[PDB]
Design a protein around this nucleic acid. Structure first.
Length: 66
DNA sequence: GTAATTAC
DNA sequence: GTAATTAC
């Protein structure tokens, strides 16, 4: 589907956007958590390194209400 | 140091 | 309590 590649704790990782639980912006950085098979993972990429799909999920996050 | 947020 | 993440 759409793989987000990132290095966390020196390790290069790849995760599908379908496993991404939460997304948020921190400056020009995009952070998120994903389903690391039960245990929750953490990751972040440069806004310039993010596939459009992830940026779309962030945009929808910023619009949420209630 | 700070920006948001969380796993640990 | 704090490390972790990119950019400034």
């Amino acid at each position: 589907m759409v793989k987000v590649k990132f290095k966390y704790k020196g390790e290069e990782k790849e995760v599908d956007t379908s496993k991404i639980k939460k997304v948020w912006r921190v400056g020009k950085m995009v952070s998120f958590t994903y389903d690391d098979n039960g245990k929750t993972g953490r990751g972040a990429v440069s806004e310039k390194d993010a596939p459009k799909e992830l940026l779309d999920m962030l945009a929808r996050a910023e619009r949420e209400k209630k």
